[PDB]
Amino acid sequence: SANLPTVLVTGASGRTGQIVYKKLKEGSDKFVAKGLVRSAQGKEKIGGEADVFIGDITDADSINPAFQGIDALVILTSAVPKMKPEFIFEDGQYPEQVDWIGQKNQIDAAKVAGVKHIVVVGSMGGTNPDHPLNKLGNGNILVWKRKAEQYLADSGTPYTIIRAGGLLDKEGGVRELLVGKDDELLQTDTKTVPRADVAEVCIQALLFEEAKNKAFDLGSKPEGTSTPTKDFKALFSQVTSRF
Numbered sequence: 001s002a003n004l005p006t007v008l009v010t011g012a013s014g015r016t017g018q019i020v021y022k023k024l025k026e027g028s029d030k031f032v033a034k035g036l037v038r039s040a041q042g043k044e045k046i047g048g049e050a051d052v053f054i055g056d057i058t059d060a061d062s063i064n065p066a067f068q069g070i071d072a073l074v075i076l077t078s079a080v081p082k083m084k085p086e087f088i089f090e091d092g093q094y095p096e097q098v099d100w101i102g103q104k105n106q107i108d109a110a111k112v113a114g115v116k117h118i119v120v121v122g123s124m125g126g127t128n129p130d131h132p133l134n135k136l137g138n139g140n141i142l143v144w145k146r147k148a149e150q151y152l153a154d155s156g157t158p159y160t161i162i163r164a165g166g167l168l169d170k171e172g173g174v175r176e177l178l179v180g181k182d183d184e185l186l187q188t189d190t191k192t193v194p195r196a197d198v199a200e201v202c203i204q205a206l207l208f209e210e211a212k213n214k215a216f217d218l219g220s221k222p223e224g225t226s227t228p229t230k231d232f233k234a235l236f237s238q239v240t241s242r243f
């Protein structure tokens with residue numbers, strides 16, 4: 001409902017996706033949480049609770065039941081390269097399928113259900129097509145995620161596209177979280193961010209109308225070298241980019 005949003009987080013058994021799933025129904029009481037995972041093994045990893053659905057984002061009908069009744073969607077799915085040290089993408093699970101088409105299917109399902117806001121987590125690097133991450137497995141993942149992104153901006157539903165810096169497994173809530181535009185942060189050395197702060201930015205984006213129709217790159221500063229961002233109003237405000 002308008003005042004108690006059902007929020008579906010997809011890739012909920014993922015590393016960032018799981019903290020997003022807990023902060024939706026825990027650190028928060030302003031949401032009814034729903035999660036989408038790719039397997040039964042993923043559903044157990046996160047508790048195996050009732051509000052978790054199983055589906056494959058490459059088969060739209062298998063994920064449609066997850067969208068029924070939702071008000072917002074946080075996409076935290078990604079093609080994931082596997083190593084045979086040389087990495088590769090399993091068949092039918094390449095970035096084109098998982099990240100372009102896989103996301104396309106989520107975004108269409110959401111429009112159907114009348115979502116008032118789709119949040120997508122991507123990666124810095126998209127302004128550079130020759131970026132090293134595209135070689136990892138022969139996928140060009142960064143370009144494919146950009147195609148999904150542009151499709152999201154193109155759909156008509158209010159969106160928030162969050163292009164994160166290198167992901168870190170470090171405590172959230174205790175850093176100077178930086179926000180930029182067009183890979184510029186890659187010139188710096190403050191181009192990486194804890195998973196927990198990305199999970200927090202998705203949750204906050206749900207609370208501030210300012211995040212609507214915005215696209216920004218997200219990085220942070222070392223811990224201890226600044227006051228923990230606690231005021232997200234300001235954080236989103238400095239973002240005027242739509243893409």
Ligand SMILES: NC(=O)c1ccc[n+]([C@@H]2O[C@H](COP(=O)([O-])OP(=O)(O)OC[C@H]3O[C@@H](n4cnc5c(N)ncnc54)[C@H](OP(=O)(O)O)[C@@H]3O)[C@@H](O)[C@H]2O)c1
Binds near residue numbers: 014038076079123
């Ligand atoms: N490389 C970096 O440092 C970096 C930098 C910036 C942004 N990012 C991005 O930011 C996001 C968060 O990263 P992360 O490591 O926290 O995520 P990740 O945990 O390790 O996982 C996303 C996870 O996505 C799910 N998934 C993959 N294919 C699927 C399919 N066909 N159907 C359903 N679910 C599927 C996976 O399911 P399983 O449970 O089955 O594995 C898993 O839940 C990703 O989109 C990533 O691309 C990464």
